[PDB]
């Protein structure tokens, strides 16, 4: 395999790990965000500002034709296909809807309003994940309204949190996100755009953390943003038994670089607060917040993740790349090694405190540190991931470059 028939050349230099090949399958798309595959293996793409587009595939996984499945200017990221293959769910910043779906023709009909009132202008993606273990259940993310959204201390803020809804219980015209139907799976989660599940049905989420981090040291503001805080994954567990896991936000953040913490020694994965005073101190975080399972580098901006299939026991993560770091970093797909229990529960191989070095590059730009976005510096910016059912092809969207790629074993 070298390339897909009729597909455009990649816009940018793309390097891949040993044993893989990469090629574009789609170009010139309008802000392609979330992607998935239906039950007949067709590719579905949210083209933010256009709608859901549907793409038939050949035996190599190349795209042969495209059509508009949902003509809608408001759906802006989230998309999933029910395990039955006969329903899809997609969202704007404000509302999640379902449609009846027929994979034979990639046709969406009979729109139904599910969940309402979610809009904010700061973090406006509403990631959708339908539980594969419990197919009547679906999760929705609502990120914070602001870098440090203090009201998110309360669950009933309806922000920086993921709720699980039972489709079969929803009134016909839908429900507010903050309602008894939206059961809090995790809160204190700044912006958890990437959501997936392991083979046991546990929900794992991945977080975009704090911008412009500082640490108060003897009353002076130390700028620690270059290498703090960590991006991170949470294991939110069984979505049929939601328990409102507290992830720490808006007060507690996760150490990436310990050398930024001179007042008292820290390890990667430890909690810190910006001020370390009043009620919400470092010690308070230790006693009250649930730790993530693994770390990824500051500002890398994970937007999706997917587990490998079959005998591939890795987690794959799309890192959109930073704006709040000099030099920039991310702009890649990475691999995190792990293992499964007998029941299919995934865990990373590295202990949390050793996880800074545990990931590795799968798909990269020429040099992530060269990706400023001014002049000729431009890079592909991974957003969405999906594996083919045979585990041989991994699709990757890049919103700002208008591309979808296939990574082939
Ligand atoms: O720290 C950063 O440099 C940085 C970069 C990006 C990015 O440009 O994608 C995001 C974030 N942070 C972030 O915190 C966040 O919630 C976020 C959401 C998105 C998105 O594309 O949906 N990008 C980013
Ligand atoms: Ca950030």
Residue numbers in the entry: 241 to 649
Lines quoted from the article behind this entry:
The enzyme, pyranose dehydrogenase (PDH), from the filamentous fungus Coprinopsis cinerea (CcPDH) of the Basidiomycete division, is composed of a catalytic PQQ-dependent domain classified as a member of the novel auxiliary activity family 12 (AA12), an AA8 cytochrome b domain, and a family 1 carbohydrate-binding module (CBM1), as defined by the Carbohydrate-Active Enzymes (CAZy) database. In the catalytic cycle of CcPDH, electrons are transferred from the reduced PQQ in the AA12 domain to heme b in the AA8 domain, which acts as a built-in mediator and transfers electrons to a heterogeneous electron acceptor. Here, we present the crystal structures of the AA12 domain in its apo- and holo-forms and the AA8 domain of this enzyme.
The asymmetric unit of the holo-AA12 domain crystal is composed of two AA12 domains, each of which has a PQQ and a calcium ion, 11 ethylene glycol molecules, 2 acetate ions, and 1,520 water molecules in the asymmetric unit. The AA12 domain exhibits a six-blade β-propeller fold that is also present in other known PQQ-dependent glucose dehydrogenases in bacteria. The PQQ molecule was bound by the AA12 domain at the bottom of the active site, which is a small cavity near the pseudosymmetry axis of the propeller fold. The C-2 and C-9 carboxyl groups of the PQQ formed ion-pair interactions with Arg273 and Arg621, respectively. The C-7 carboxyl groups of PQQ interact through hydrogen bonds with His539 and the amide groups of Trp563 and Asn564 on the main chain. The ortho-quinone O-4 was connected by a hydrogen bond to Asn431, and the side chains of His363 and the O-5 atom were bonded to Arg430 and the calcium ion. The catalytic calcium ion was also ligated to the N-6 nitrogen and the C-7 carboxyl group of the PQQ. The calcium ion is a seven-coordinate pentagonal bipyramid with axial ligands to the side chain carboxylate of Asp451 and a water molecule. The ethylene glycol molecules bound at the active site of the AA12 domain apparently mimic the hydroxyl groups of the bound glucose in sGDH, suggesting that CcPDH shares the mechanism for binding and, consequently, the means of oxidizing pyranose with those of sGDH.
